[PDB]
């Protein structure tokens with residue numbers, strides 16, 4: 097039963113927004129309802145983070161930290177100089193000031209949020225040697241996130257995360273297809289992309305890059321500006337971290353903490369053609385994933401890059417193979433769940449038959465008991481022991 101009372105913190109992917117955005121239409125729950133509310137109602141204290149959807153995992157980590165303890169976002173001086181964006185971002189009140197006094201949390205992340213979560217846990221525990229060295233050499237201030245020694249995260253649970261990247265980034269037309277998912281979520285929320293709404297609606301939180309939707313500019317128009325901006329052309333981007341090479345790079349330094357439990361859930365919404373060996377999208381998958389993305393994922397091979405048949409199964413957006421945990425460029429160990437959740441390693445909870453967006457309720461799927469899924473997940477997280485004694 098319950099063994100800890102750590103609060104749960106939700107974290108989105110390359111799409112996502114705060115509770116007040118999209119006129120209330122939740123990322124965590126979508127057409128289903130409000131996941132956070134379900135958990136709160138059932139006795140699992142839960143909060144939601146909202147960071148930059150298209151920003152680099154690093155940026156997102158920095159934003160999350162600030163968002164969790166309060167203060168002004170500090171991306172790190174070395175980092176900011178390297179990538180040419182602002183050092184300081186937006187300020188936050190802090191959702192959980194208790195973290196500054198011994199508290200702990202469980203992070204439940206979806207999609208790219210799993211990469212963010214892992215990076216956050218890595219920075220909190222080990223800081224950034226680079227950031228630390230730069231401060232000493234240049235006399236600049238240093239964010240507590242880069243010092244090391246924080247123990248805030250009891251667990252990290254990922255759902256449909258591209259731990260090893262996604263080959264979707266290899267599509268010749270990825271640029272346009274990816275932003276189309278930005279239009280999709282807008283459509284799910286009943287928001288048009290060809291309208292210059294005066295209300296913010298969906299804030300990409302690109303304060304470091306000094307980009308924002310301007311008066312008279314629809315999302316469609318904005319997206320075209322973004323495609324040409326550094327949030328799309330730089331290596332300090334979600335675009336980069338999402339790619340197979342990018343994820344590998346990340347995995348080479350973002351390691352599982354021995355003091356944290358990691359759980360992984362994979363998603364699949366495809367079938368295998370008996371003659372092609374390819375995978376095809378199942379009935380029920382959103383049109384934005386099914387037309388050109390799912391088929392590309394289910395048929396794209398590249399032997400030099402090491403994309404083989406194992407990678408074809410997918411959830412319309414990410415290759416299932418890349419979800420159970422980091423593998424490419426990683427020293428992290430993955431163990432198939434057996435009824436016991438082990439600390440400091442990836443507990444592969446298996447593959448669920450739900451698509452990238454049906455898993456968080458953004459796309460309907462009446463056959464998927466979303467409430468049960470999340471309640472069972474919470475139940476599991478609340479049963480983890482912050483201190484596991486060794487035994488026979």
Ligand SMILES: [Ca+2]
Nearest residue numbers: 380381460461
């Ligand atoms: Ca569906």
Ligand SMILES: [Zn+2]
Nearest residue numbers: 152155179332
């Ligand atoms: Zn950055």
